[PDB]
């Protein structure tokens, strides 16, 4: 019975599905990171602008 | 073949496995890293809300 060996073969097949799926995910994180940093900076910009006589920046 | 290709093929599958484990780790790191950025974001939004009461 290679039935035990055969099953091992597709677990390997599955392993390279899950691998392929992890890398696609990891790629999604990279773009998501790029989008979130833009978001944080915009929020920071809002605060900066909003800071009306409660704080002060650009100070030598 | 026997000495063989097969052997190299087996190693090649082993690299695939450690590469899977690596990716799964790095994705988990991203999750935590992102959760913390969300904490920062929520704080930023709380700050903006407060700051916007003085604009009123």
């Amino acid at each position: 019975a290679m039935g035990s060996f055969n099953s091992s073969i597709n677990n390997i097949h599955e392993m390279e599905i899950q691998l392929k799926d992890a890398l696609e995910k990891n790629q999604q994180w990279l773009v998501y990171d790029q989008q979130r940093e833009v978001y944080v900076k915009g929020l920071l910009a809002k605060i900066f602008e909003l800071e009306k006589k409660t704080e002060t920046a650009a100070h030598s | 073949g026997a000495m063989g290709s097969f052997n190299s093929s087996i190693n090649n599958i082993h690299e695939m496995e450690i590469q899977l484990k690596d990716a799964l780790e790095k994705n988990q790191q991203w999750l935590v890293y992102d959760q913390q950025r969300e904490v920062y974001v929520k704080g930023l939004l709380a700050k903006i809300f407060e700051l916007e009461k003085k604009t009123e």
Partner: peptide, 13 residues
């Protein structure tokens, strides 16, 4: 070529 975060803890820009 999988990549993790720049560092384990988040540091704002």
């Amino acid at each position: 070529q999988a990549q993790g975060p720049p560092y384990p803890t988040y540091i704002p820009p």
